[PDB]
Design a protein around this motif. Structure first.
Motif, PDB file in Angstrom:
ATOM      1  N   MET A   1       0.902  -1.191   0.096  1.00  0.00           N
ATOM      2  CA  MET A   1       0.064  -0.037   0.119  1.00  0.00           C
ATOM      3  C   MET A   1       0.889   1.234   0.020  1.00  0.00           C
ATOM      4  SD  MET A   1      -2.776  -1.415  -0.477  1.00  0.00           S
ATOM      5  CE  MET A   1      -3.868   0.027  -0.722  1.00  0.00           C
ATOM      6  N   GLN A   2       2.146   1.226   0.579  1.00  0.00           N
ATOM      7  CA  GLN A   2       3.183   2.368   0.353  1.00  0.00           C
ATOM      8  C   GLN A   2       3.807   2.369  -0.682  1.00  0.00           C
ATOM      9  OE1 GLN A   2       3.780   4.635   2.873  1.00  0.00           O
ATOM     10  NE2 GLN A   2       1.867   3.980   3.906  1.00  0.00           N
ATOM     11  N   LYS A   3       3.590   1.565  -1.862  1.00  0.00           N
ATOM     12  CA  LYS A   3       4.315   1.351  -3.228  1.00  0.00           C
ATOM     13  C   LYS A   3       5.870   1.597  -3.015  1.00  0.00           C
ATOM     14  CE  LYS A   3       0.648   4.143  -5.160  1.00  0.00           C
ATOM     15  NZ  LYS A   3       0.066   5.310  -5.941  1.00  0.00           N
ATOM     16  N   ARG A   4       6.304   0.595  -2.056  1.00  0.00           N
ATOM     17  CA  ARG A   4       7.782   0.792  -1.795  1.00  0.00           C
ATOM     18  C   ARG A   4       8.553  -0.502  -2.253  1.00  0.00           C
ATOM     19  NH1 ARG A   4      11.498   0.377   2.512  1.00  0.00           N
ATOM     20  NH2 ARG A   4      10.201  -1.051   3.833  1.00  0.00           N
ATOM     21  N   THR A   5       8.159  -1.120  -3.114  1.00  0.00           N
ATOM     22  CA  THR A   5       8.522  -2.230  -3.895  1.00  0.00           C
ATOM     23  C   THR A   5       9.444  -1.601  -5.122  1.00  0.00           C
ATOM     24  OG1 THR A   5       6.968  -2.825  -5.373  1.00  0.00           O
ATOM     25  CG2 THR A   5       6.874  -3.602  -3.003  1.00  0.00           C
ATOM     26  N   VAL A   6      10.779  -2.268  -5.364  1.00  0.00           N
ATOM     27  CA  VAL A   6      11.636  -2.217  -6.372  1.00  0.00           C
ATOM     28  C   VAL A   6      11.470  -3.027  -7.444  1.00  0.00           C
ATOM     29  CG1 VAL A   6      13.980  -2.019  -7.298  1.00  0.00           C
ATOM     30  CG2 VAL A   6      13.478  -0.703  -5.158  1.00  0.00           C
ATOM     31  N   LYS A   7      11.390  -4.633  -7.120  1.00  0.00           N
ATOM     32  CA  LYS A   7      11.299  -5.667  -8.216  1.00  0.00           C
ATOM     33  C   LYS A   7      11.197  -6.918  -7.169  1.00  0.00           C
ATOM     34  CE  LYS A   7      14.913  -6.926 -10.527  1.00  0.00           C
ATOM     35  NZ  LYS A   7      14.946  -8.395 -10.206  1.00  0.00           N
ATOM     36  N   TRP A   8      10.776  -7.882  -8.210  1.00  0.00           N
ATOM     37  CA  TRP A   8      11.046  -9.172  -7.770  1.00  0.00           C
ATOM     38  C   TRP A   8      12.128  -9.940  -7.840  1.00  0.00           C
ATOM     39  CZ3 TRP A   8       6.883 -11.335  -4.687  1.00  0.00           C
ATOM     40  CH2 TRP A   8       5.981 -10.819  -5.058  1.00  0.00           C
ATOM     41  N   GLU A   9      12.814 -10.484  -6.973  1.00  0.00           N
ATOM     42  CA  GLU A   9      13.996 -11.140  -7.277  1.00  0.00           C
ATOM     43  C   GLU A   9      13.730 -12.389  -7.947  1.00  0.00           C
ATOM     44  OE1 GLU A   9      17.039  -9.968  -6.162  1.00  0.00           O
ATOM     45  OE2 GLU A   9      16.623  -8.705  -4.685  1.00  0.00           O
ATOM     46  N   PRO A  10      15.079 -12.677  -8.786  1.00  0.00           N
ATOM     47  CA  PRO A  10      14.796 -14.039  -9.498  1.00  0.00           C
ATOM     48  C   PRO A  10      14.389 -15.171  -8.589  1.00  0.00           C
ATOM     49  CG  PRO A  10      16.761 -12.931 -10.057  1.00  0.00           C
ATOM     50  CD  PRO A  10      16.257 -12.207  -8.878  1.00  0.00           C
ATOM     51  N   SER A  11      13.708 -16.179  -9.338  1.00  0.00           N
ATOM     52  CA  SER A  11      13.083 -17.220  -8.357  1.00  0.00           C
ATOM     53  C   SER A  11      13.036 -18.624  -8.868  1.00  0.00           C
ATOM     54  CB  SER A  11      11.688 -16.996  -7.774  1.00  0.00           C
ATOM     55  OG  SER A  11      11.000 -17.078  -9.114  1.00  0.00           O
ATOM     56  N   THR A  12      13.122 -19.510  -8.126  1.00  0.00           N
ATOM     57  CA  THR A  12      12.984 -20.989  -8.794  1.00  0.00           C
ATOM     58  C   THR A  12      11.591 -21.590  -8.344  1.00  0.00           C
ATOM     59  OG1 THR A  12      15.195 -21.356  -8.551  1.00  0.00           O
ATOM     60  CG2 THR A  12      14.255 -23.157  -9.057  1.00  0.00           C
ATOM     61  N   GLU A  13      10.791 -21.882  -9.299  1.00  0.00           N
ATOM     62  CA  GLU A  13       9.493 -22.387  -8.879  1.00  0.00           C
ATOM     63  C   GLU A  13       9.669 -23.932  -8.924  1.00  0.00           C
ATOM     64  OE1 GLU A  13       6.455 -21.953 -11.853  1.00  0.00           O
ATOM     65  OE2 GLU A  13       4.851 -22.400 -10.728  1.00  0.00           O
ATOM     66  N   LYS A  14       9.163 -24.574  -8.051  1.00  0.00           N
ATOM     67  CA  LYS A  14       9.106 -26.140  -7.903  1.00  0.00           C
ATOM     68  C   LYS A  14       7.749 -26.758  -7.994  1.00  0.00           C
ATOM     69  CE  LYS A  14      12.692 -24.558  -5.708  1.00  0.00           C
ATOM     70  NZ  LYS A  14      13.715 -25.381  -5.267  1.00  0.00           N
ATOM     71  N   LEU A  15       7.819 -27.415  -9.154  1.00  0.00           N
ATOM     72  CA  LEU A  15       6.452 -28.141  -9.552  1.00  0.00           C
ATOM     73  C   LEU A  15       6.382 -29.723  -9.329  1.00  0.00           C
ATOM     74  CD1 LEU A  15       7.649 -25.957 -11.899  1.00  0.00           C
ATOM     75  CD2 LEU A  15       5.671 -26.159 -12.711  1.00  0.00           C
TER      76      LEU A  15
END
Lengths: 213, 213, 213, 213
Positions: free
Chosen positions: C128-142
């Motif tokens: 709600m404060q709009k204080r995000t920069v980006k998502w870090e790279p991730s690894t999805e487990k399927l």
């Protein structure tokens, strides 16, 4: 003055469960000071609902709760302007339902704009297999957080052929004007489907609620 | 016959919070049929405790709950053999406490063997900064699951200078013999520290509990 | 045969965050075999958005993931009929977002019907404060469960001025026809807003994904 | 200087699962710079263990992780003084394990003091049923908060007869002295029981870990 002993209810819920859309409309009557309400609900889209109707019923207004003189009533204070609420409903098998209600007042009639979205209910679970009987009575715990009112409740659906299926409710209530914030208190609830047709396209729903501290 | 109107309590808790070990011993008296108990607790290891004492108090016996004749009493049934319980206490800021109690009976005296382990409390949080005042009264929801009894409760610690700090209790109760399993019911609780020394090395703790349905 | 090296994307998202309704449309292009996609997104209703745009971006298709020969491709198999997914996104401060996407194929163009609903985001939280920069790279487990494919990922948003903000994703993927099921595998993700205006009314969004065992 | 290419491990774990007490000792060797370790583990109390051994294995030191030049090594920096960690392990069926490790260094040998406490594992769940095969390879995400290092990982146990069982790890690492803090990075893990007897009284455990950005 604004809150009358006898008031009306008109609602529309739009939503989806597991990606399948639905809509329900309802009309009802409530006694705000007695903490009692009843309504008739009609499934308009998505019927016959492929999920347990019970997951919806607590989404179909804490103005319908008997508040004693010694407890600050956040909800009756909020009108005529009204209030909105947001809720997460976290079921023990990973099914999660998010819901909102925007509540306004037209004369003696409350108007609800409701959104409901549930995901990740297992196909073989009690919700998608329609194996629920009713919600048990409950005690909601209400507390102020950052200028608004929070309400959390441990909920349980009784299952056909025995046992219970647990859900954790977390609600945030937001008045549309400045009202007095209450001290920590409780609201006892009992919600019941009194009658319904075979596929729950028509449902008569009742709730009784009383606050205490 | 086995449960007397006036009974004694002796306990030892061994545990750790954020990797720092501690131990507490207590002696007390309880009225099982009146749902009232009180005890004096002494910190034996890890003192002065660097965390809020309140996180421990609900770990220091549902036999001390007033059960009406129409509700099956899982706990008083379990004796002389007794029962054990396991509990997770999930705080809103990620602090998690796990606890167990093995309860046996020696004459008219209950003996508790308690383990308590908490992790991931933030250094600047209300627990590690000792900013809690008391637990609010509560309503525990009790339900049978796979032949044993579960009890869940939404708990809240009032904070110094305003607001609340929420914790979700999930308890599993396990009788050491075959007893009757109750229907869905509730237990109202109110736990209070009535007196303590400056650093909580000595604490007088009280609880009142009543079951209802 | 229906999966081409170069394919188009058209989408509409209808949603709400903390009861605030909004709508976004998108057009883009992707390379299914290279696991790369990009799109231009336009806020059509509810602008300017009062929340961090980053909560939406992973909702704006695992068909755009480079799958090696040794792993069964659940998603490329599902077409031309297509598939749908449901997701719960559970943030560490109690904010919860549920989302769904129904993906169909018309010629060389994927069509998305998206629903997004978030509740209980704290007023002072980074969303709600709009204080995000980006998502870090991730690894999805399927992994497979109940004849459908589940995908879980531990996600983190980088925060402006330092620090991180955690979210746990639980996705269920559902093919519209019977397809071969894969064994346990991983998908590496990198999602980036390459350009945007001040209010995020217009956003250029890129994603790269690669499967591995 | 204090970190050698070849180092020894000695450990003791004291713990409980569902109130069942147990103790395990271990001796091993590891290569800190290559991120490889192995150990022999012996059940000393509470045998034969009535739960899946796999819940313990990730508790049996990130000093055994290959760190590249471009990433700050929080763990190798902390010695000779050492570091401690706390972890919550939240299983999808409500079982929760809390664990701590206090790591010291005596010569070329690491000494672990371990505490392990698990509660609320369902009787019919894969842990109490001993139906786990192995942990799948994982990617831990490490990030700074409040001047300490956090490590979170989405974990999955392969189940005997098929399927998977999910657990979310939240670890806090705490150096005993002031050390340089790393930026957001990943550690790939692969843990394997290479040999064991029927009751897991004796277990040979291996882990390989590599950091990357």
């Amino acid at each position: 003055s604004v809150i009358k002993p006898d008031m009306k209810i008109k609602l529309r819920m739009e939503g989806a469960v597991n990606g399948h859309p639905f809509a329900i409309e309802g009309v009802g009557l409530g006694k705000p000071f007695e903490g009692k309400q009843s309504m008739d609900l009609k499934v308009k889209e998505g019927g016959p609902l492929p999920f347990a109707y019970d997951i919806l019923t607590t989404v179909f207004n804490r103005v319908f709760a008997k508040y004693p003189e010694n407890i600050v009533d956040y909800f009756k204070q909020s009108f005529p302007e009204g209030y909105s609420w947001e809720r997460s409903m976290n079921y023990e098998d990973g099914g999660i339902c998010n819901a909102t209600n925007d509540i306004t007042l037209d004369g003696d009639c409350y108007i609800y704009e409701i959104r409901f979205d549930g995901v990740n209910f297992p196909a073989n679970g009690p919700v998608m297999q329609k194996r629920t009987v009713k919600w048990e009575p409950s005690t909601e715990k209400l507390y102020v957080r950052d200028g608004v009112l929070k309400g959390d409740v441990n909920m349980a659906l009784s299952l056909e052929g025995g046992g219970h299926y647990r859900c954790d409710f977390k609600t945030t209530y937001k008045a549309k004007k400045v009202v007095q914030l209450p001290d920590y208190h409780f609201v006892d609830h009992h919600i019941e489907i009194k009658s319904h047709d075979k596929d729950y396209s028509n449902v008569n729903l009742h709730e009784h609620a009383e606050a205490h501290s």
